[PDB]
Scaffold this active site. Structure first.
Site, PDB file in Angstrom:
ATOM      1  N   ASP A   1      -3.590   4.843  -1.273  1.00  0.00           N
ATOM      2  CA  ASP A   1      -4.459   5.436  -0.303  1.00  0.00           C
ATOM      3  C   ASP A   1      -4.144   6.910  -0.383  1.00  0.00           C
ATOM      4  O   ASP A   1      -3.024   7.323  -0.102  1.00  0.00           O
ATOM      5  CB  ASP A   1      -4.137   4.894   1.078  1.00  0.00           C
ATOM      6  CG  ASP A   1      -5.160   5.293   2.126  1.00  0.00           C
ATOM      7  OD1 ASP A   1      -5.971   6.222   1.905  1.00  0.00           O
ATOM      8  OD2 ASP A   1      -5.152   4.662   3.186  1.00  0.00           O
TER       9      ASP A   1
ATOM     10  N   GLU B   1      -4.939  -5.097   6.598  1.00  0.00           N
ATOM     11  CA  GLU B   1      -3.699  -4.354   6.770  1.00  0.00           C
ATOM     12  C   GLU B   1      -3.364  -4.326   8.255  1.00  0.00           C
ATOM     13  O   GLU B   1      -2.912  -3.316   8.777  1.00  0.00           O
ATOM     14  CB  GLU B   1      -3.826  -2.936   6.200  1.00  0.00           C
ATOM     15  CG  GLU B   1      -4.952  -2.124   6.825  1.00  0.00           C
ATOM     16  CD  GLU B   1      -5.100  -0.755   6.219  1.00  0.00           C
ATOM     17  OE1 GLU B   1      -4.565  -0.513   5.118  1.00  0.00           O
ATOM     18  OE2 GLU B   1      -5.767   0.088   6.857  1.00  0.00           O
TER      19      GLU B   1
ATOM     20  N   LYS C   1       0.882   5.445   0.390  1.00  0.00           N
ATOM     21  CA  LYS C   1       0.184   6.641   0.843  1.00  0.00           C
ATOM     22  C   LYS C   1       0.610   7.789  -0.042  1.00  0.00           C
ATOM     23  O   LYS C   1       1.788   8.164  -0.047  1.00  0.00           O
ATOM     24  CB  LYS C   1       0.591   6.973   2.256  1.00  0.00           C
ATOM     25  CG  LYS C   1       0.160   5.977   3.245  1.00  0.00           C
ATOM     26  CD  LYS C   1      -0.568   6.720   4.301  1.00  0.00           C
ATOM     27  CE  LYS C   1      -0.991   5.811   5.417  1.00  0.00           C
ATOM     28  NZ  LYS C   1      -1.843   6.595   6.340  1.00  0.00           N
TER      29      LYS C   1
ATOM     30  N   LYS D   1       0.821  -1.183   0.000  1.00  0.00           N
ATOM     31  CA  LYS D   1       0.000   0.000   0.000  1.00  0.00           C
ATOM     32  C   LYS D   1       0.865   1.247   0.000  1.00  0.00           C
ATOM     33  O   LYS D   1       1.850   1.335   0.735  1.00  0.00           O
ATOM     34  CB  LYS D   1      -0.898  -0.046   1.230  1.00  0.00           C
ATOM     35  CG  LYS D   1      -1.933   1.028   1.311  1.00  0.00           C
ATOM     36  CD  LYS D   1      -2.779   0.810   2.517  1.00  0.00           C
ATOM     37  CE  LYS D   1      -3.274   2.116   3.043  1.00  0.00           C
ATOM     38  NZ  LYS D   1      -4.410   1.909   3.964  1.00  0.00           N
TER      39      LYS D   1
ATOM     40  N   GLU E   1      -7.935   3.807  -2.588  1.00  0.00           N
ATOM     41  CA  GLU E   1      -8.597   4.038  -1.322  1.00  0.00           C
ATOM     42  C   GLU E   1      -8.813   5.514  -1.008  1.00  0.00           C
ATOM     43  O   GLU E   1      -7.875   6.301  -1.049  1.00  0.00           O
ATOM     44  CB  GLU E   1      -7.791   3.351  -0.224  1.00  0.00           C
ATOM     45  CG  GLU E   1      -8.352   3.476   1.167  1.00  0.00           C
ATOM     46  CD  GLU E   1      -7.578   2.658   2.172  1.00  0.00           C
ATOM     47  OE1 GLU E   1      -6.552   2.059   1.828  1.00  0.00           O
ATOM     48  OE2 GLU E   1      -8.014   2.570   3.325  1.00  0.00           O
TER      49      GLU E   1
ATOM     50  N   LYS F   1     -13.026  -0.769  10.145  1.00  0.00           N
ATOM     51  CA  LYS F   1     -12.184  -0.408  11.271  1.00  0.00           C
ATOM     52  C   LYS F   1     -13.020  -0.401  12.532  1.00  0.00           C
ATOM     53  O   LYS F   1     -14.002   0.343  12.624  1.00  0.00           O
ATOM     54  CB  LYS F   1     -11.557   0.971  11.065  1.00  0.00           C
ATOM     55  CG  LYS F   1     -10.649   1.048   9.862  1.00  0.00           C
ATOM     56  CD  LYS F   1      -9.989   2.385   9.792  1.00  0.00           C
ATOM     57  CE  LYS F   1      -8.999   2.436   8.641  1.00  0.00           C
ATOM     58  NZ  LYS F   1      -8.218   3.711   8.687  1.00  0.00           N
TER      59      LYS F   1
ATOM     60  N   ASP G   1     -13.095   4.683   3.276  1.00  0.00           N
ATOM     61  CA  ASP G   1     -12.526   4.554   4.606  1.00  0.00           C
ATOM     62  C   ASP G   1     -13.028   5.679   5.498  1.00  0.00           C
ATOM     63  O   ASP G   1     -13.866   5.448   6.363  1.00  0.00           O
ATOM     64  CB  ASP G   1     -11.001   4.541   4.580  1.00  0.00           C
ATOM     65  CG  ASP G   1     -10.395   4.392   5.973  1.00  0.00           C
ATOM     66  OD1 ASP G   1     -11.134   4.356   6.979  1.00  0.00           O
ATOM     67  OD2 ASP G   1      -9.166   4.324   6.083  1.00  0.00           O
TER      68      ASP G   1
HETATM   69 MN   LIG Z   1      -7.294   4.597   4.530  1.00  0.00          MN
END
Ligand SMILES: [Mn+2]
Ligand SMILES: [Mn+2]
Ligand SMILES: [Mn+2]
Ligand SMILES: [Mn+2]
Lengths: 360, 360, 360, 360
Positions: free
Chosen positions: D186, D315, D157, D155, D212, D261, D237
């Site tokens: 993301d 993750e 960022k 992943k 994401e 989450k 998310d």
């Molecule tokens: Mn996220």
């Protein structure tokens, strides 16, 4: 058995009110069996694209030549062929299909309703249109029809006079008859949405059971809006000029009731497609008419007998308006209903003498 | 503990009204613990896809063989496995899950409601269906139930007679009981949208608290339209035949209340998924039933006890309709509610003698 | 002619791959005519609500008793009655209707297609499912079928392996066959929308003609979105579990092609209602199957012959998978098509010896 | 067993990158059993409404006092009570529920996953965030993780640098790793819809598996539009800050994947409601994290083990970022997955010495 000849005859019959023009179809097959059909409208071109004159010209020049030579027993193949060469022309197609179904019923010894799958009933409730224009006379005619047990459902044609004049007329009739009769209206596309808003509320609040085609078919959104706000249910009639229109209105939620007319869809089998679409969507049914004589009335009736449910009945009273007929067998109206026999085909035969007398 | 044997027994019990057929499930585990479940419907195939006969045949031939050998303590794994081999079959799945939950509750010494998270109440309000057909008798039965403090919420099944006849019946009952009772109706999909339009208005204007499933589940748009126009709230029942249907109806705004039935969703845990979806959308809840005996009633009740709120109560009165039962512990109906004990499992044990006597 | 007896027989036949279970229906009428039908599924309860066991139990206990005594010649009345007592149970209804139609065809001396209106063709294009799992073998089987002129349209079942593995497999097969064959896929609801997004693009870009049921029927919005974005057209199969579902999907624009299966709709006449709805909306057709033997295949075929157009052909290859049959007349697969004779009924007769040999 | 004391401890742990702040909860019950939970966030108030300081203050002043005295074994009743006195505060609620579940698991001798219904797996695939900022270093770290078989899903960022700079970075990494790894991004709400339009296309065309949260949760329409046009699937998310948000996004079709989450929903049971909603709509799942230590990671994991399917993995690599821990049991990362034992509760115990050493 092959189709050998198809004759389209324009016939003018006298009414109890003026004349009514019918286009009688005669389809002769090689096995000697003959089928009769009917393609009729109201007021020339005022209530549809097809006139008696237009219907005959197209049958003679285009539709008939396409069928001579084909198997008379394969109705599907014949009707699909017509759809391939002719756009629309549903009234003409309706007469042709009615005749092929009649011939095929006589050939196999079965009533058209059985060819269409099988009847679930033998009679249909029939509504009556109070058309004198005079409120006092209308109430009187209604009391009479109830007395002799011929009709208990009444239809009023409004929209030609000022809104408030028509509303007074309709409310007075429902007020005086009370719970003894069902009162319904038909506005024949005469109002615009702005007039219908208040009119539908008044009618609904005063016991009118349903409002038929209040606004024009061109105003789709208006039909959807009225379907959601009117206290009394909205029935579509003129908005359906084909089976595909029925799907469209169903998908849109433009009406909670559909009027079924063989002439507007293309015949007895076509009207069943429209009815099937409505059934799959949960839309209520009503058996409509274009004021046909006995041939067209019986052709409609035979299809309506196969339906699971017709929540709002029918208006197959066309023969009752004619003083003279062209068939030998008079229809049986008894106990608020029209009764259909289990004879082969449409169960009717032409009266050659009266036919020759009224044919133009 | 593993699942060793699963028995599906069809039992016909006599009612106070005729018989009611139950499919009793017995799941025996290797640790000696046995769990009991119930899969019941009304009228064979008239109110659902599954009949008692169909339920047993599928359990014996497909569902049961897939579970023999699996850990009895892993309910999630077991139920997910069934979803992988079997489409639908929610009634059968409901009986199986109820039995696994019962066994697991006895094993851990906890009531099923605690296995499901924890109860927030110990009793549930129970509505009563007035079904005599006679208005005078119904009012009398209602006055009685209020007198002995058994019921103060009444449900009327309508839709089988002419609309106006059913409306008169319902309005008379609410008129005579007044503010002492809550009166609700259930149309069981019997009306089409055109009939419901006026009927929902009359009922709503005359104090009926809610209208349950007025039109068929096939008419989605009609449900959305009625949800926006009816004076009294619309509750969905037959429209929910799975958890996914609940999401769909919620996303569409097809009803402001959902009836929760373990049989229609797939068991006590499944019904909680449906309830959770409704909660996330702000849709009110009602505890429904398929007229189950005590096993199915308690299995439903244990799930409903965990719910934050059930705005419209429940109708878990199934055992009150049976003259004979197959369990030893009679349910406690007292002060307008059904009371649920804190005993392990569903808190019920089979009466082997009555079971053998009524098993077909 | 009245319905005297209805027998539901479970028959296990061996396949070229393992067995296939059929439920053969035999309806005996008072005039000595017998009609045969078929209700078959794939994998017990894995591809539908009804299993062979459930089908027989319901026919014996509920469906059959409701028909004994009724006129065998009024199919509409008989099928409407079943809809009134039984919710769903379409496979069972399909077998029953097929049998009544067969009997009625033998009685009147007409092929079922003619009872349904009239055929517009005598043969139907048939696709073939390449199911070996091995890419090299599949290409070989495909080259062979093209060689002997049996099939030129191939279907691949994917979704059970990692997306990228299935995509490689499918793309390689289309790459090697080129323009000589039509390659299509069927994902059987195995992907979620997130997987389908990229997969549909890759397939569409690499010459796959259509993508059948990529995602689950529970994801309606996803179907609508994929119908608007996928380079290759989306066909609905599992999403149709009734005629009313077809209307819903049409109104929503969830697919541009509908798979027509008699078992999923309720019989030959029922599948025609679904097809009519699609036609009125402009949705393309495809003749599907549930891997039926010759009875069910011919029952499907007779209905498909009446259709104006089946843009994507059919997959009526079920009999080719069975090593042994229970009828005397083998189907004619020749020149990429299945040929249907003009013999009365379904044109098939049972082989009493093989029937008794394979009946469980 | 009643809840006697609840302690909220702020702990600052060192990371491999800087520190990470955790709020460790210790719930002591009257039967001597203690449950531990975790409420952790990233960057104070930068990634959510709750900060470590705010979390502790609210637990001490409002949340804890409401629970002292209640049955420790009725988690549902306890959590529903908190929803009644406190709006939001999901991170805090998540820590509390995790602790009650831990205590209850130790009490009954079952792993939390079994309390939640039963696990369908024992390990979960774990993705790794390449965060060095340097493309060359990231590729190297990725090759290493693949080598030691720890991660094969990566992943990235992005969003803090110019769009075109981030795109180059991401495309280069996918280009060099090829089909050996799954590369995802993301954007953490950093782009506006106008930037995302082209960026999502480039990423999708260059093999990025999913995008994401590209744009802010405030732009709902933009999420719906990107969900329909981006070549690579959109995962939500930050748009999910409650279970009700999940329903809303599902109903809207704002994403084809949901990140789950526990901190954003309210705990292990709450995250299951969100997952159930997604499942009923056909939306894919992914197990997310807020960079929790082992308590929060295992609390998340135990819930994810009960899920039917997690299409995009998880993750749960939070513990791998911490150099020091406060529990005695280190998590097992082996063969691209995190392995979860079948020990009671979360299967973890506090290291009193390291706790006292890192507690602020
Ligand atoms: Mn996220
Ligand atoms: Mn009209
Ligand atoms: Mn109900
Ligand atoms: Mn398929």
């Amino acid at each position: 058995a092959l189709i050998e000849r198809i004759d389209a005859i324009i016939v003018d019959l006298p009414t109890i009110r003026q004349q009514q023009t019918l286009v009688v179809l005669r389809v002769r097959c090689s096995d000697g069996v003959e089928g009769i059909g009917e393609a009729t409208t109201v007021g020339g071109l005022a209530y549809g694209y097809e006139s008696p004159e237009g219907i005959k010209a197209n049958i003679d020049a285009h539709l008939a030549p396409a069928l001579i030579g084909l198997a008379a027993d394969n109705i599907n193949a014949a009707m699909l062929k017509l759809d391939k060469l002719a756009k629309g022309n549903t009234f003409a197609k309706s007469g042709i299909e009615s005749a092929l179904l009649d011939a095929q019923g006589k050939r196999l010894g079965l009533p058209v309703s059985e060819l269409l799958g099988g009847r679930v009933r033998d009679s249909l409730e029939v509504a009556w249109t109070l058309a004198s224009g005079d409120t006092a006379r209308d109430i009187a005619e209604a009391r009479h029809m109830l007395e002799i047990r011929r009709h208990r459902v009444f239809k009023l044609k409004i929209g030609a006079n000022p809104v408030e004049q028509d509303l007074k007329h309709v409310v007075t009739i429902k007020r005086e008859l009370g719970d003894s009769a069902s009162v319904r209206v038909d506005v024949n596309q005469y109002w615009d949405e702005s007039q219908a808003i208040r009119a539908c509320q008044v009618l609904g609040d005063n016991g009118i059971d349903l409002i038929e085609q209040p606004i024009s078919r061109i105003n789709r959104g208006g039909q959807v809006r009225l379907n959601q706000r009117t206290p009394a249910p909205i029935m579509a009639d003129e908005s359906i000029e084909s089976v595909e229109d029925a799907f469209s209105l169903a998908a849109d939620g433009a009406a909670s009731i559909f009027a079924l007319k063989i002439a507007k869809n293309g015949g007895p089998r076509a009207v069943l497609r429209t009815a099937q679409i409505a059934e799959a969507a949960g839309i209520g049914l009503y058996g409509g008419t274009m004021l046909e004589g006995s041939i067209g009335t019986l052709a409609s009736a035979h299809a309506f007998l196969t339906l699971r449910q017709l929540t709002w009945g029918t208006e197959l009273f066309g023969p009752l308006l004619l003083t003279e007929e062209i068939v030998n067998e008079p229809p049986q109206y008894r106990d608020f209903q029209l009764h259909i026999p289990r004879t082969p085909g449409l169960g009717l035969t032409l009266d050659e003498q009266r036919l020759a007398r009224f044919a133009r």
